[PDB]
Symmetry: D2
Subunit: 392 residues, 4 copies
């Protein structure tokens, strides 16, 4: 009922319950005590029989979880030490040897490495499918298919999946659909509202917004999230989020809407500019009318995002020269920071892939990815302009 | 001369850090940053292409975590350290790296509840074979070694009954057959016991406990060879768990480590007095404290541990019934899990820390009904004695 | 010259100087060591001579100071433990027995109390003057007049001072002009560009933006700020800011432009709404055409701000009924949080005044002050609407 | 009464009142909200009547204050941003023009500068007396003597005052006794139990113990502490302590007894070593039988402390060479850290004095001060031994 910005500030917290504290106190405590051992045993017996209690759990983490659940429109949330923590805790819970996971064609490097060199080496079967192509996806479904996992838009080429289409297919086989919603955040896209079962985030990125914490979030139905908490997190990863970092993340979430509006406004201008430049061969930005999945993008995303990928005609050398000339944009991995960032993976940083896997899946050569920050657009334009000139 | 190793307390405070290299900051600055930037695109391919081949020295490693790691490595006498989000982070990152389907892991008979659950309901369900062996019985361990045995994993002393393994004995068997020995050294810390110096390959900690000392962070540490720690960093942590430690918490952990020697001295002094007191009170059936000659592995404890630790496991006459009345009358001790806190704690393993085990598994792996576990804290021993004294009275 | 948002994010820091750290590391250290004692002696010799040096000062604090100096367009900045730390350190440095200070007619309660019950009881003369009346100000000048101090807009009438007019007069008589710029922030108003010598802030408010730190800032000339640092702060108050809180304040400043845009947009809608309602006797909001100093406010402020003050018909009883009915606004003092706040200033934030002095210095009974937060405006409209119905 | 160590860990906190949190949550919030306005006005009515309330007060700071009060044996505590914050807030409250303050002959440099160049330029009269000479103190007393202020032992020569003897004189004449107890901590010396009215600390030093926060503490009667809070802190300094730093200080306090035991044990060995070395002319350590006030040290301090002062035969030249040679000790001001520190008081901590004021007030040009840390004593002896060789 209250609006997104209202919920991002207030959801799950009334100051009058914590001595009037306007900002909730930070529970930086590894443990909680009991009034009797009988009461203590009841807390662990509940958890031992699959029930999450909110007594032997941290109220700072609980509040972050409830708030993220509200923003994504899910039943329950789980906070973890990183995006990789969210992903691995989720998949280790849901998969066992002989199960199959159907994967988007393009994934974040460490997700790819986890799948191919981690869980995939313990007898879990993997298959990559184009998640926009529903007839290909339907034909890839097998009785072993238990999870469908993808990012949308897909890092780093912005390929989109048809989330409602995927969910419709999955539902015929009872398969669980997991969407990495890092790029969009719940402010731009809510995959659970389109039929996904679970969403994962690297909250290290836009949710934090300020580049100072590492964190992960899972949001979904109570039964799935409980199992990921009690098995994935507790037993299989130990990817515990610091209450300090959780509190900072909640601080970032309070400006999520305002930050995302600005990331998007800035990236729209840079995309319009780059699409016209002679040095630029191709560009991937969902807000351009020429984006191949323009219509699908606008069905799922309320705004076209803060990320741009493009390719320079001069290939790898031009890519390098462009990167090296940047003075305001920083040369770095990561995204979703106040500071604008750039990376040119042909100076390898989707490096978990071999050269042939990068070619087979959608990762190129003159390809530069920009995380457009919150700086004054006129300064960002000037920096991109002179770097483009230097790329000759 | 200058080739003398600085003492433990000196290293816990100074190792790896010279204020001169950070503008004279006496306390190292906290690198609370998710990412690091590059001067050129080429310095950057060099870090990531380099990380992929096998090596860790991505100079985009977090200096706060790196100092913590180097300091823990120095204290344990290992080549390299890795900092993680929790003790379970350290354990799972290690075992996910070292084991694949068809490998066998030999396990100590008694394990921390979530370690047991990880093994039996986690990695053991992905094709890794498990077998439990009494790691104090070297003949039984030898007999259990198979060509598929890849890892030997145990705690010493074990949570919660304080059963000991002969670490050098285990390591000798592991050298003959080829297995990697991993020791959970949480209870002792490097101040009391250094398994790597006894021939273990890797040590893991829940740094949440004594290393922190103050119960305000959750954290894990792995120490061992450069080769094994790099592998665990680059696969286990980076790909299989994501159990990343906050630089804020790493800095708090380092702060705690600066008083580790002084705190452990007081934990052990207090526990020795309390254990001697408890052994003489009418209501106590048995007491297991490594510092008493009644301790079943007294001489092994004396040999491996420089002091007998801060943990007491005991059992009242009255069984579990009296255990609950005793624990309920405590007024200074808190009823809580965890250990290695400044605050004294009392818990009941069978319904709390080892709730992950079934009842028959608890009977099978040496976890009794009636066991009361004390984590003896840093309070005035006369106050702790008075508290235990009055609670004993109320349990009668 | 880079834009405001760019400078709020980047000014004074290049990652390449701190091992590539994108976010500057937090120097949570009470002290710094010297390579030699001659080097150490030289540092202390510098500050005895009156000069400030970067070594033997904290880099986290120094960055915050440099960044605030850039945003206000001043030479030098100083960070302190609170707004009152900024104000007291400043006035303790600049005044001595027999000096006079001319004050705006209405001040923040603790500033008032400091002046009247603190430094004023140590032989410093005070006189209150309307700082929008240049002839009254000119008339009140004496050879002893050393400092002119005021807030603009002043709480909670929002009375504006003519900063450039006041400064012209001050330059003639050789007085130092100090402006408490808490309400506007450098994003809306830069009193140094209008001729002020020093600006002070409660950075606890909008600069932080998230209600989790207490902090103060002074900005002005190098010569003045050095004296305030070396005498007021080091000797007379000891109001030292934690590097942890300074880092959080910098995190807040990174979204200042975005947050102030939203605070202002929301406040405008509520002010316009309040003006059309029958329960409202009178409303003080700079952005309404009917505001008495509308033109002077537009000349000094780029936007009309996030603070609204107003009187209900029904006086104090209606005020109580309104406040006690609020369900989304919180009853609290403070301002400039993400959370919307409401208060009654006579019994709370100006409780340092006696009943004669509340009436003496334009502080009404029946006045309600709103700090309009960042929540969805439709939610804020709904809460104000239902609370007005409950006021009747 | 539970033991010191017990109280340092537990006093004032029951986990059961905060959902079983074993560590108290950190209230990192600038403000607190109200359930009604008349509730809010009751709190600020209370503060105008001189009464301190728990609501609109920070529970983290309150716990620190209660704990510090317990350890000193006092009724009430106050936490501030620095030791100078404690000192200034106290003296600004207690003194007015015409009042006389009697001072120990040797004070910390910024305390000296605050007195002579700050409050002493606002009409407060100052006189220095030897607080060990009770005849001379008695003879210096006047009816205008409002405050007697000293450190014991004094920074930096270790000269002591007989606190109970001074207190007797103060009671006869009607003066308030303020003792800076920074060097000893409550673990070694409790001036309130010897008749002092107030104690102040730089909690930056031993209480923190780890060199990572800046903080001050005042302890004394509820009557005095309330006045210092409501005037000195609220109005005259704004020296507000961060809840983050308060929480860290409480963390430090939990090991105070263990750290001080080690500091003192190391310092005794080092002092005994220094006493036998040919390069050393004189040493000031309370634990040596040769200390002029050995008997009074043993009466009044339970251990001789972690601080050593000594003079090298070769004067300032040898002092410099000694300092520059140290490899394990750091050259730094500050004290009470885990890390061992060394400095030259005349050019550093007492550089606010002129050359002639140092000569007059017992601050030699040749003095070296050591803050003996927690490192292995054999390592510290080796470093000192080589630096003594190098001093020639
Ligand atoms: C080598 S550091 C660079 C990391 C980047 N991204 C992270 C990320 C993760 C993993 O999230 P953490 O574990 O919190 O890092 C998961 N899912 C997505 C879509 C992500 O973008 C990056 O450079 O784009
Ligand atoms: C149910 S909370 C109680 C936890 C307790 N112990 C933890 C522990 C871990 C796991 O460490 P984290 O992941 O940091 O918690 C690993 N290894 C050992 C020998 C341990 O004791 C306990 O109550 O004894
Ligand atoms: C009784 S708590 C309410 C405090 C409020 N204000 C603070 C303030 C200060 C002092 O700033 P700190 O020292 O940081 O608090 C200075 N100058 C101005 C224009 C301020 O608004 C309040 O508005 O209700
Ligand atoms: C020039 S920085 C070195 C400071 C030193 N001491 C400080 C101190 C203070 C003031 O304490 P803060 O305001 O917290 O720094 C008060 N009282 C005493 C007995 C002190 O020693 C020093 O090097 O001994």
């Amino acid at each position: 009922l209250p609006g997104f910005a209202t919920r991002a500030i207030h959801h799950g917290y009334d100051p009058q319950d914590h001595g009037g504290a306007l900002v909730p106190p930070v529970y930086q405590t590894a443990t909680f005590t009991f009034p009797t051992v009988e009461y203590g045993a009841a807390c662990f017996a509940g958890e031992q029989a699959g029930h999450f209690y909110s007594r032997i759990s941290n109220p700072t983490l609980n509040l972050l979880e409830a708030r993220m659940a509200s923003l994504e429109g899910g039943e329950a949330g789980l906070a973890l030490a990183s995006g990789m923590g969210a992903i691995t805790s989720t998949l280790w819970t849901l998969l066992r040897p002989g199960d199959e996971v159907l994967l988007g064609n393009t994934l974040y490097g460490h997700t790819f490495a986890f799948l191919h060199h981690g869980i995939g080496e313990f007898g879990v079967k993997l298959r990559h499918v184009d998640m926009a192509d529903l007839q290909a996806l339907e034909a890839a479904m097998t009785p072993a298919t238990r999870v469908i996992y993808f990012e949308s838009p897909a890092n780093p080429n912005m390929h989109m999946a048809d989330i409602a289409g995927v969910a419709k297919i999955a539902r015929k086989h009872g398969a669980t659909v997991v969407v990495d919603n890092t790029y969009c955040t719940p402010y731009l896209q809510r995959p659970l509202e389109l039929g996904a079962d679970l969403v994962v985030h690297s909250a290290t990125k836009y949710l934090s917004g300020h580049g100072d914490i590492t964190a992960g979030i899972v949001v979904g139905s109570q039964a799935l999230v409980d199992r990921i908490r009690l098995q994935g997190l507790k037993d299989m990863t130990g990817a515990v989020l610091s209450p300090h970092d959780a509190a900072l993340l909640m601080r970032g979430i309070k400006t999520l809407n305002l930050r995302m509006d600005r990331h998007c406004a800035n990236a729209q201008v840079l995309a319009e500019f780059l699409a016209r430049q002679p040095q630029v061969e191709l560009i991937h930005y969902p807000g351009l009318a020429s984006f191949p999945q323009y219509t699908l993008a606008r069905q799922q995303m309320s705004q076209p995002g803060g990320m741009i990928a493009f390719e320079l005609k001069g290939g790898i050398g031009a890519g390098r020269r462009f990167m090296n000339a940047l003075q305001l944009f920083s040369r770095a991995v990561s995204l979703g920071d106040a500071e604008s960032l750039a990376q040119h993976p042909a100076s390898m940083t989707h490096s978990s892939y071999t050269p042939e896997e990068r070619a087979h899946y959608g990762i190129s050569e003159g390809l530069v990815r920009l995380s457009v920050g919150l700086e004054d657009i006129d300064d960002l334009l000037a920096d991109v302009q002179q770097a483009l000139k230097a790329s000759a």
